[PDB]
Each structure stands twice: as C-alpha cells, then as structure tokens.
Design an enzyme around this catalytic site. Structure first.
Site, PDB file in Angstrom:
ATOM      1  N   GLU A  73      -4.923   4.100 -10.722  1.00  0.00           N
ATOM      2  CA  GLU A  73      -5.762   2.925 -10.512  1.00  0.00           C
ATOM      3  C   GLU A  73      -6.899   2.867 -11.515  1.00  0.00           C
ATOM      4  O   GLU A  73      -7.135   1.829 -12.136  1.00  0.00           O
ATOM      5  CB  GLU A  73      -6.332   2.918  -9.097  1.00  0.00           C
ATOM      6  CG  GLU A  73      -5.291   2.658  -8.018  1.00  0.00           C
ATOM      7  CD  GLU A  73      -5.899   2.652  -6.618  1.00  0.00           C
ATOM      8  OE1 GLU A  73      -6.020   3.739  -6.001  1.00  0.00           O
ATOM      9  OE2 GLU A  73      -6.246   1.554  -6.133  1.00  0.00           O
ATOM     10  N   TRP A  93      -9.122   6.427  -0.547  1.00  0.00           N
ATOM     11  CA  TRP A  93      -9.429   7.169  -1.771  1.00  0.00           C
ATOM     12  C   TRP A  93      -8.433   6.782  -2.864  1.00  0.00           C
ATOM     13  O   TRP A  93      -7.344   6.286  -2.573  1.00  0.00           O
ATOM     14  CB  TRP A  93      -9.390   8.685  -1.549  1.00  0.00           C
ATOM     15  CG  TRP A  93      -8.098   9.144  -0.988  1.00  0.00           C
ATOM     16  CD1 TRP A  93      -6.922   9.349  -1.671  1.00  0.00           C
ATOM     17  CD2 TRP A  93      -7.828   9.448   0.383  1.00  0.00           C
ATOM     18  NE1 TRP A  93      -5.945   9.766  -0.801  1.00  0.00           N
ATOM     19  CE2 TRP A  93      -6.472   9.837   0.463  1.00  0.00           C
ATOM     20  CE3 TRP A  93      -8.602   9.436   1.549  1.00  0.00           C
ATOM     21  CZ2 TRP A  93      -5.879  10.209   1.670  1.00  0.00           C
ATOM     22  CZ3 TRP A  93      -8.012   9.804   2.739  1.00  0.00           C
ATOM     23  CH2 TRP A  93      -6.664  10.189   2.792  1.00  0.00           C
ATOM     24  N   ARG A 140      -0.026   4.477   2.921  1.00  0.00           N
ATOM     25  CA  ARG A 140       0.051   4.225   4.355  1.00  0.00           C
ATOM     26  C   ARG A 140       0.465   5.411   5.223  1.00  0.00           C
ATOM     27  O   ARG A 140       0.494   5.293   6.449  1.00  0.00           O
ATOM     28  CB  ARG A 140       0.984   3.042   4.642  1.00  0.00           C
ATOM     29  CG  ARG A 140       0.393   1.669   4.346  1.00  0.00           C
ATOM     30  CD  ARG A 140       1.442   0.609   4.643  1.00  0.00           C
ATOM     31  NE  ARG A 140       2.404   0.471   3.547  1.00  0.00           N
ATOM     32  CZ  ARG A 140       3.553  -0.188   3.638  1.00  0.00           C
ATOM     33  NH1 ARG A 140       3.890  -0.751   4.798  1.00  0.00           N
ATOM     34  NH2 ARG A 140       4.363  -0.272   2.570  1.00  0.00           N
ATOM     35  N   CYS A 144       0.830  -1.208   0.000  1.00  0.00           N
ATOM     36  CA  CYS A 144       0.000   0.000   0.000  1.00  0.00           C
ATOM     37  C   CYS A 144       0.861   1.253   0.000  1.00  0.00           C
ATOM     38  O   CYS A 144       1.625   1.489   0.945  1.00  0.00           O
ATOM     39  CB  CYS A 144      -0.935   0.008   1.218  1.00  0.00           C
ATOM     40  SG  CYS A 144      -1.949   1.501   1.343  1.00  0.00           S
TER      41      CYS A 144
HETATM   42  C1  HEM Z   1      -6.306   6.516   1.881  1.00  0.00           C
HETATM   43  C2  HEM Z   1      -5.769   6.451   0.656  1.00  0.00           C
HETATM   44  C3  HEM Z   1      -5.180   5.148   0.047  1.00  0.00           C
HETATM   45  C4  HEM Z   1      -4.468   5.098  -1.088  1.00  0.00           C
HETATM   46  C5  HEM Z   1      -4.113   6.309  -1.974  1.00  0.00           C
HETATM   47  C6  HEM Z   1      -4.108   3.718  -1.339  1.00  0.00           C
HETATM   48  C7  HEM Z   1      -3.385   3.222  -2.400  1.00  0.00           C
HETATM   49  C8  HEM Z   1      -3.138   1.887  -2.695  1.00  0.00           C
HETATM   50  C9  HEM Z   1      -2.710   1.350  -3.987  1.00  0.00           C
HETATM   51  C10 HEM Z   1      -2.484   2.176  -5.271  1.00  0.00           C
HETATM   52  C11 HEM Z   1      -2.573   0.023  -3.869  1.00  0.00           C
HETATM   53  C12 HEM Z   1      -2.152  -0.926  -5.011  1.00  0.00           C
HETATM   54  C13 HEM Z   1      -3.382  -1.734  -5.420  1.00  0.00           C
HETATM   55  C14 HEM Z   1      -3.546  -1.771  -6.918  1.00  0.00           C
HETATM   56  O1  HEM Z   1      -2.757  -1.093  -7.628  1.00  0.00           O
HETATM   57  O2  HEM Z   1      -4.473  -2.475  -7.406  1.00  0.00           O
HETATM   58  C15 HEM Z   1      -2.907  -0.345  -2.496  1.00  0.00           C
HETATM   59  C16 HEM Z   1      -2.876  -1.606  -1.938  1.00  0.00           C
HETATM   60  C17 HEM Z   1      -3.348  -1.967  -0.686  1.00  0.00           C
HETATM   61  N1  HEM Z   1      -3.934  -1.131   0.274  1.00  0.00           N
HETATM   62 FE1  HEM Z   1      -3.923   1.001   0.192  1.00  0.00          FE
HETATM   63  N2  HEM Z   1      -4.614   2.951  -0.305  1.00  0.00           N
HETATM   64  C18 HEM Z   1      -5.286   3.790   0.562  1.00  0.00           C
HETATM   65  C19 HEM Z   1      -5.948   3.358   1.696  1.00  0.00           C
HETATM   66  C20 HEM Z   1      -5.931   2.100   2.256  1.00  0.00           C
HETATM   67  C21 HEM Z   1      -6.644   1.707   3.464  1.00  0.00           C
HETATM   68  C22 HEM Z   1      -7.565   2.686   4.239  1.00  0.00           C
HETATM   69  C23 HEM Z   1      -6.377   0.402   3.699  1.00  0.00           C
HETATM   70  C24 HEM Z   1      -6.853  -0.515   4.854  1.00  0.00           C
HETATM   71  C25 HEM Z   1      -7.394  -0.040   5.984  1.00  0.00           C
HETATM   72  C26 HEM Z   1      -5.466  -0.054   2.660  1.00  0.00           C
HETATM   73  C27 HEM Z   1      -4.924  -1.310   2.536  1.00  0.00           C
HETATM   74  C28 HEM Z   1      -4.311  -1.839   1.420  1.00  0.00           C
HETATM   75  C29 HEM Z   1      -3.966  -3.234   1.237  1.00  0.00           C
HETATM   76  C30 HEM Z   1      -4.156  -4.432   2.199  1.00  0.00           C
HETATM   77  C31 HEM Z   1      -3.322  -3.306  -0.149  1.00  0.00           C
HETATM   78  C32 HEM Z   1      -2.776  -4.582  -0.806  1.00  0.00           C
HETATM   79  C33 HEM Z   1      -3.942  -5.476  -1.203  1.00  0.00           C
HETATM   80  C34 HEM Z   1      -3.355  -6.544  -2.075  1.00  0.00           C
HETATM   81  O3  HEM Z   1      -2.308  -7.117  -1.657  1.00  0.00           O
HETATM   82  O4  HEM Z   1      -3.921  -6.822  -3.173  1.00  0.00           O
HETATM   83  N3  HEM Z   1      -5.236   1.006   1.817  1.00  0.00           N
HETATM   84  N4  HEM Z   1      -3.233   0.821  -1.822  1.00  0.00           N
HETATM   85  C1  LIG Z   2      -8.786  -9.094  -4.825  1.00  0.00           C
HETATM   86  N1  LIG Z   2      -8.431  -8.539  -3.508  1.00  0.00           N
HETATM   87  C2  LIG Z   2      -6.978  -8.372  -3.394  1.00  0.00           C
HETATM   88  C3  LIG Z   2      -9.113  -7.256  -3.231  1.00  0.00           C
HETATM   89  C4  LIG Z   2      -9.031  -6.171  -4.274  1.00  0.00           C
HETATM   90  C5  LIG Z   2     -10.069  -5.958  -5.179  1.00  0.00           C
HETATM   91  C6  LIG Z   2      -9.953  -4.937  -6.116  1.00  0.00           C
HETATM   92  C7  LIG Z   2      -8.820  -4.121  -6.128  1.00  0.00           C
HETATM   93  C8  LIG Z   2      -7.796  -4.334  -5.206  1.00  0.00           C
HETATM   94  N2  LIG Z   2      -6.678  -3.582  -5.159  1.00  0.00           N
HETATM   95  C9  LIG Z   2      -5.903  -3.623  -3.928  1.00  0.00           C
HETATM   96  C10 LIG Z   2      -6.242  -2.399  -3.102  1.00  0.00           C
HETATM   97  C11 LIG Z   2      -6.468  -2.501  -1.728  1.00  0.00           C
HETATM   98  C12 LIG Z   2      -6.785  -1.362  -0.983  1.00  0.00           C
HETATM   99  C13 LIG Z   2      -6.863  -0.124  -1.611  1.00  0.00           C
HETATM  100  C14 LIG Z   2      -7.165   1.021  -0.887  1.00  0.00           C
HETATM  101  C15 LIG Z   2      -7.243   2.242  -1.560  1.00  0.00           C
HETATM  102  C16 LIG Z   2      -6.988   2.308  -2.927  1.00  0.00           C
HETATM  103  N3  LIG Z   2      -7.054   3.498  -3.585  1.00  0.00           N
HETATM  104  N4  LIG Z   2      -6.693   1.176  -3.606  1.00  0.00           N
HETATM  105  C17 LIG Z   2      -6.628  -0.022  -2.982  1.00  0.00           C
HETATM  106  C18 LIG Z   2      -6.322  -1.154  -3.723  1.00  0.00           C
HETATM  107  C19 LIG Z   2      -7.916  -5.349  -4.279  1.00  0.00           C
END
Ligand code: HEM
Ligand SMILES: CN(C)Cc1cccc(NCc2ccc3ccc(N)nc3c2)c1
Ligand code: HEM
Ligand SMILES: CN(C)Cc1cccc(NCc2ccc3ccc(N)nc3c2)c1
Ligand SMILES: C[C@H](O)[C@H](O)[C@H]1CNc2nc(N)[nH]c(=O)c2N1
Ligand SMILES: C[C@H](O)[C@H](O)[C@H]1CNc2nc(N)[nH]c(=O)c2N1
Ligand SMILES: [Zn+2]
Lengths: 411, 407
Positions: free
Chosen positions: B283, B278, B109, B106
């Site tokens: 994305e 958000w 964070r 993420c």
């Molecule tokens: C608040 C603004 C946030 C932004 C800008 C953000 C951004 C991102 C992005 C760009 C990814 C890559 C996923 C992808 O490209 O498909 C990601 C992954 C992830 N985010 Fe964040 N996120 C935010 C909030 C959060 C919150 C609130 C949580 C949990 C409470 C969280 C937990 C995670 C987790 C667990 C992943 C990895 C999931 C996986 O392994 O597929 N994120 N995030």
């Molecule tokens: C399939 N699972 C890993 C859940 C799932 C479904 C669809 C998209 C994603 N992307 C990972 C992910 C997790 C948390 C996020 C929080 C905020 C954000 N902007 N993107 C985030 C993206 C994750």
C-alpha cells in the site's frame, strides 16, 4: 446507450457504444460477478442469423453494406445452408474473420498487432500428415529466424462434430513433463498429462528437462497421430543473466515461438476446431509464469539461493527479488539472440494506445483486466489504472474441451 | 445456482451458496462485466431491519425465539412511530464486524471478528468528534502494536444532519501545487490540502505535513483540528542495504484509518464511521511511493541504484520497486510497528476463504482488489477463482461532502 471507462492515472474518459453489438453471455449477472472465473453439431435453425450477422459486419467493413454483392452473398449462403446444412467462407471472409477474432480477444494484451496476421488457409487438408506439413510451414514462417511474424493456420471446420480436426497439443511447441515415482516432476509440470498420452501413443521420451513434445494431430475425427517437428524448425534460447554469470549454469532455455493450438475459432456460426495461431512472447509469460509459478518449473528457490538472499522470512521479499532477476534474464537472452520478445511495460503501454484508438475508431475495446494486467509489477504498468469493459464479440476464439476427454476411439 | 470456485495452483474447489443471500447489485450484466470499474422511507426501512435482525438472531442460535419475535415487533413499532430506529449495542457491534466481513475488496478480513467497536452515537459536535477520534487513534495505535477499531457516529436522519469526516483517512500527508508546475507532498490530497487552507488551515507548506482533521457534526459547517503529534505514529524509511536510502527523506505513518466511507446496518446509514487496522507493505511502497500520480520516486531511487534506466526492458522500475518494498517492511518491523507483507496477507486470506466457505458457505471477493499491486502471480490469491457479490451490512462509498454541503 453509453458506458464510460476512466483511467484513474490520467483521468482520460472513454465512451463505449460497441458493447451494444454484444450478444453472447459473460457469465456475470446483476447479483454476481464471475470476472475472475477462468472458464465460466449446430443446426441450420440457428445458423443463418449467425451467418447473416457476420456477413453484415464483413460488408460494412469493406463499405459495401446493402450492395448487390452483399445481397447476392447472403442469398448464396442462405441456399447453401438450407441445401447442405452448412456453408463455406470465401478466402476474404476467412481472413477478415480470423483477424477479428483476434481483435475481439478481450484477454489479449497484444492486440495492437491484430490487423497484421498472416492467415494460412488449410481447409483443403484431409489427413494428419497433411496437418503436420501445414504446421511445419506455419512454424518456419512464423519463426522467421527469430524475427517473429504473427500467423494462424485454419484447418477444416466442424461438420457433424464426429469428424473434427484437432491439434491435441495445447501449444505447437512445449516441453515434456514426467511424474517420477518419488513424486517429483522432470520437465514441465504443466504438460504431464499430455506427455503421458504421447508416450502411450508410442512416443519415445528422451526424458530430459527440455524435451520438445511431438505433435499429436487429429484429422477428420480419426485417431490422432504422432509427428516430430524437425528440430531445426524449433528456435530455442539459452537463458542467461547479464550480471549473474552463474545463471547460465541453471541449464534453462525456452522456445522462441508461442503458438496456441487448442482453441476454437468461431466465424459466422462456423466452428474451426483446429486453428493454431502464434505471435511472440511477453517476457513475463516465461519469466513469471513458466519459471516461477509454484506449479511450473518453480526455480525461485534455487535462483534465490544463488543470490544469497534472506530466504528465512517472506518479508525479505526474496521471492519478489528472484522473480525480477529471472525476468531480466529472459528478456536479456532473447534480445541478445535477436528473438522477438516484448517486456510488460512496452506491451501494456502499447495496449493502452490500441485501446484508446479502438474506442475512437470502433466505439470500444472489450478487455479483461484480470488477464490484461501483467503477473508482476501490476500497478507500475498503465493498464492497472485503466477501467475496462469486458464483453463478448464474434468472430471469437473460444475454449473447447481437451479432445482426449471427448474423442471416440477407432483403434 | 450453486457455484464452485477453483484454485488453479491446488485444484481445491469450494462451493458457494452464500451468494444466494445477496441483495444489492454488482454493476455487471449477462452482456457485460464491470469487474474493473472502480465504482459501478418507512416502507424501505422495515424489511431491511428484518433481514438484519433475522441474520443477527440466527447468528446467536435464537432464530425463531420470543426475543427475536419481540425485537422484530419492537423495531417494527419504533419504525411505524419514529420513521427510523436505534440499534442495540450488541447489534451495532455485530453489524460493524459483518460490514468488514463482507468487504469483498479487503484482503485482511481474516481478522474480522476481532474489531474493537466504539459507540460514538452520543456525539453532538465537531469537538466531540475530535475527542472520539483522538481516542480511536491512541487505542488503535497502541504504541505500534496496532489494533483494529471503528468509531461510529450518529446515523443519518434526514440527510440534513449528517455527521461527516471530510478527510479520506484520519492521517494523511499534505499536497500543494507549486508555481514550478509540479506538486509538493501528496498529489492525491492536493484538493483536500486546498480546502483545509480555504477553511482556514495554516499549511507548513512542507512535504510530509500530517493533514488537520476537518470534522462535520449534525450537518453544520466543518471545523479544523490538529491531531496531537504524539498520537501520530510515523516510521522513517531506511533500507537494510542502501544507506543512501535515508537521505531520500521518506517516512510514512503507521495507522491506516479510512474515514470517508458509509456504514450500512439494517437499513440505517452511518455517514461517519472511521475505521482502522494496519498496513500491507505494498500500500505504501508500491502505491503511495511508486504510483505516477502519487509520490512517484521510482526514477530517483533507480538513479541511486545506478540501474540502466535507458530501456524499459532492463526492468529497472521492477528492481527498484522491490527494494523500496523491502525497505518499507524493514523500517516498520525494526520500529516494532505492525505491518504485513503481501505474501503473508494473501496466504492468510486463502485460509480465511477456506474458513468462510466451510462455516458460512462462501466469501464475497474482488480479485481485482485482492491481488496485490506487485508480484501478483507468485501470491496464492492470483490463482484463486473468486466470486464477487454484495452482502449487507456493508461499507459503501459516498460523495465527497464539499460537492454536497448545503453551507
Ligand atoms: C487489519 C488489517 C487490514 C489489512 C491488512 C487490510 C488490507 C486491505 C487492502 C490492501 C485493501 C485494498 C485497498 C487498496 O489497495 O487501496 C483493503 C480494502 C478494504 N478494507 Fe481492509 N485491511 C485491514 C483492515 C480493515 C478493517 C479493520 C476494515 C473495516 C472495519 C477494512 C475494510 C475495508 C474496506 C471496506 C475495503 C474496500 C474499500 C474500497 O472499496 O475502496 N479493512 N483492505
Ligand atoms: C476513497 N475511499 C474509498 C476511502 C479510502 C481512502 C484511502 C485509501 C483507501 N483504500 C481502501 C482501504 C480501506 C480500508 C483499509 C484498511 C486497512 C488497510 N491497510 N488498507 C485499507 C484500504 C480507501
Ligand atoms: C503478437 C504478439 C502477442 C502477444 C505479445 C500476446 C500476448 C498475450 C498474453 C500475454 C496473453 C495472456 C495469456 C497468459 O498470460 O496466459 C494473451 C492471450 C490471448 N491471445 Fe494474445 N498475444 C499475441 C498474439 C496473439 C495472436 C496472433 C492471437 C490470435 C490470432 C492471439 C490471441 C489471444 C487469445 C485468444 C488470448 C486469450 C487466451 C485465453 O483466453 O486463455 N494473441 N495474449
Ligand atoms: C489453454 N490454451 C488456450 C492454450 C494455452 C496454453 C498455455 C498458455 C496459454 N496462454 C493463452 C495465450 C493465448 C494466445 C497467446 C498469444 C501470444 C502469446 N505471447 N501468448 C498467448 C497466450 C494458452
Ligand atoms: C482501474 C482499476 O479498477 C483500478 O486501478 C483499481 C485496480 N485494482 C486496485 N486494487 C487495489 N487493492 N486498490 C486499488 O486502488 C485498485 N485500483
Ligand atoms: C483465478 C484467476 O482467474 C486465474 O489465476 C487467472 C488470473 N489472470 C491470469 N492472467 C493471465 N494473463 N494468465 C493467466 O493464466 C491468468 N490466470
Ligand atoms: Zn462481472
């Protein structure tokens, strides 16, 4: 055992058995991944098993495993090792080794070409002047008037580690970098340390933005000597943009031949510390890294200004926009001058095909995603969606420390 | 044993000791790196609880306190007796924030400590789950001023009474396979868009149809519910230069709300814990719009720009890809909906890394995921070495319910 990789775009699944042949360490463990870490005098003792492993691979590839030729060669090598403490590779083995080091380079996206490498045997070389001559011939041959040909020149292997052949340049052809008293940098900021060494060694710097650096060549552990590559051998390309006429006025150009010269080639336990090799450029190497890295020429700003982009907010993506046009210009200039270059779409597409072919014919293809994915437009290339397994196979290209840090000066 | 990471753009070196706390496995070995692989009882329970309470009681400067020792005792008692245990609200909130803090993939964070935690552990039915989810959405959306939140449903008991949200995100667009051969709407959700129908949904067989919620309480059969449209904030996509852009008919939702992960705290498993923050612009624009197995509109956009789509080397895809992403950001910013560009987010992340190395001794990070899907090397994270390891509390992947549901 089996390991499977999946392409999440095509659902194509591949099976790796080749990783079982891997001996060397990755740097990773069960508890940590060092996948994005840039970088994570040998005795008769450990040398024969290395030679044997190599000779087994070599004789399998020519369908002569367990042959009398195979066995005699093992015996020959064994005796030479216990007699002389090292051994010499046959020409055949050298060529095979060099190609396989390239085939094994997990960070190289250009590997579809691995079987077509021109190997130049320079193991009879004894002086820096001799090194200069070999390198000149490499450059002329590789360049081929713009129709680039992959090549490698192999200087004598390490013996006691006190008589190394080294090319002190990181690449055969590169531009000087000069730190100014005001803090700014003239030329290539990546090459400041090396430029300074050259200057100290007696190089007379023209002090321009695109001065081709001299060769600094070390033969047999002696102090390195300076040589100037004949300018008619250095193919260069003026960078212009096909729609933007102001782009030529930025005064940029780049050399045509990428020739990496600071790596160590390992084959059957032997170490070739001077082994310059060359292919051709993927456009992003110049257009993204060389021009747009903040720690390089860093021309994004001036380009963006001339495009009259909104440079106030980063969310305008002016940086992204200027980056693309610069890369367009690099590709355009090279093609227009008929100098071999490949765009990142073409290259990655080719690599996926290579990779699949390797899984089928070879049981795998070690690959470093972190390096294989292009530095721009990553997800719109097919490698982005490709799972990859990274592991180390020999023969290989290895990093080595910069010689100026280890060299004992004679004077 | 004490690892250093170098940033190659700045020469800043950080020293990681935090990885020594790591407990779970990475997938890698000394012989192989799996960095680019997408997914590589009473006894078990107590050390897990203990480890958590230890780090919790340390975090509030009460390590080695009566309260700590008592809580340890109390939890230990409850485990011996009940074969599980319940978290105090304080531990729940701490655990949730730290699961986010520990999410090595993420980039966002830096905001980890400002998470709004909704305790839905009193929920018993899909209708209840629906109510809690609508409340989450409305709170998080906040008329465009997005606020991070997580809603936590009852923990696993015996794998038979599982609470599950079957959607991958609370808000996603439908995808239906045509006889034409192609795909209408979102190709990623075709299988889900099917299962909704198969369980009774009435598809408007449009393109951007907000999918219904499929909610599963206490292990029972999942039920369909429609989220009130007024709760679903959407953004029409226009370009601040190309007025033909609007006629593409593109829009996207403001709230990314991931709903299919498993939250693990102190050995306890929360199979239903939808969370939201958000979007980063890429994305939607890079992945959602331009991925080949998604909305895949690059070709159409390039045409309208009349770019030389004849040879790859013209970089037409690259040019279009940028414009699209400029438009995404433009639309959201215009409509006052929170969004972050990849430059700002990655810069924020580098600072967060520095903060984490300072105050915590490290920050687990997955370079493969942290580096944005476009313009990678002109963002600071590309030149940043990162170390990847698993810390707990954590969000984990879990199997899709339909492959598992004992109907
Ligand atoms: C608040 C603004 C946030 C932004 C800008 C953000 C951004 C991102 C992005 C760009 C990814 C890559 C996923 C992808 O490209 O498909 C990601 C992954 C992830 N985010 Fe964040 N996120 C935010 C909030 C959060 C919150 C609130 C949580 C949990 C409470 C969280 C937990 C995670 C987790 C667990 C992943 C990895 C999931 C996986 O392994 O597929 N994120 N995030
Ligand atoms: C399939 N699972 C890993 C859940 C799932 C479904 C669809 C998209 C994603 N992307 C990972 C992910 C997790 C948390 C996020 C929080 C905020 C954000 N902007 N993107 C985030 C993206 C994750
Ligand atoms: C012929 C066309 C070739 C292309 C298009 C190509 C492309 C590339 C690129 C883009 C990289 C990443 C380096 C960076 O971006 O900084 C790379 C790495 C590498 N290439 Fe190739 N290459 C070619 C030929 C060769 C040849 C001929 C050899 C050796 C005989 C070779 C061996 C390697 C090695 C060892 C690396 C890893 C270097 C490192 O670890 O820093 N390549 N290649
Ligand atoms: C650091 N040294 C390995 C030399 C050096 C200096 C600057 C850049 C690179 N890039 C690695 C590298 C290695 C081999 C290559 C072969 C062909 C090519 N087009 N680029 C290639 C790039 C390598
Ligand atoms: C094969 C590869 O692991 C896969 O495409 C990954 C690469 N990096 C990613 N990075 C992010 N942020 N999101 C993703 O879905 C992926 N997918
Ligand atoms: C920290 C990170 O490993 C480093 O910046 C790497 C990332 N990937 C790369 N990929 C290529 N092709 N070339 C590079 O120099 C790098 N640098
Ligand atoms: Zn690894």
């Amino acid at each position: 055992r089996f390991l499977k990789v999946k392409n999440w775009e095509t659902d194509v699944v591949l099976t790796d058995t080749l990783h079982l042949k891997s001996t060397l360490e990755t740097g990773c463990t069960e508890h940590i991944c060092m996948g994005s870490i840039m970088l994570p005098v040998r005795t008769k003792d450990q040398l024969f098993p290395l030679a044997k492993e190599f000779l087994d691979q070599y004789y399998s590839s020519i369908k002569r495993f367990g042959s009398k030729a195979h066995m005699d060669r093992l015996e020959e090598v064994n005796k030479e090792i216990e007699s002389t403490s090292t051994y010499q590779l046959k020409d055949t083995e050298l060529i095979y080794g060099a190609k396989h080091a390239w085939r094994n380079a997990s960070r190289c996206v250009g590997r579809i070409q691995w079987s077509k490498l021109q190997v130049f045997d320079a193991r009879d070389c004894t002086t820096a002047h001799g090194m200069f001559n070999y390198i000149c011939n490499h450059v002329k041959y590789a360049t081929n008037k713009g129709n680039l040909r992959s090549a490698i020149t192999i200087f004598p292997q390490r013996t006691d580690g006190k008589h190394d052949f080294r090319v002190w340049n990181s690449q055969l052809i590169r531009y000087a970098g000069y730190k100014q008293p005001d803090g700014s940098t003239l030329g290539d900021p990546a090459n400041v340390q090396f430029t300074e060494i050259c200057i100290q060694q007696g190089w007379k710097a023209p002090r321009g933005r695109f001065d081709v650096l001299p060769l600094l060549l070390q033969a047999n552990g002696n102090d390195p000597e300076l040589f100037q590559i004949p300018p008619e051998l250095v193919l260069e390309v003026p960078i212009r943009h096909p729609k933007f006429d102001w782009f030529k006025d930025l005064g940029l150009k780049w050399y045509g031949l990428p020739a990496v010269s600071n790596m160590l080639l390992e084959i059957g336990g032997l170490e070739f510390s001077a082994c310059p090799f060359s292919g051709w450029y993927m456009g992003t190497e110049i257009g993204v890294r060389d021009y747009c890295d903040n720690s390089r020429y860093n021309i994004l700003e001036e380009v963006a200004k001339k495009m009259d982009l909104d440079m106030r907010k980063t969310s305008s993506l002016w940086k992204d926009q200027a980056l693309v046009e610069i890369n367009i210009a690099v590709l355009y200039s090279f093609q227009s001058d008929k100098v071999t270059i490949v765009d990142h779409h073409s290259a990655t597409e080719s690599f996926i095909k290579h990779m699949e072919n390797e899984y089928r014919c070879r049981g795998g293809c070690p690959a470093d995603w972190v390096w294989i994915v292009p530095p721009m437009s990553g997800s719109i290339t097919p490698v982005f969606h490709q799972e990859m397994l990274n592991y180390r196979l020999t023969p290989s290209f290895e990093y080595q420390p910069d010689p100026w840090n280890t060299h004992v000066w004679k004077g």
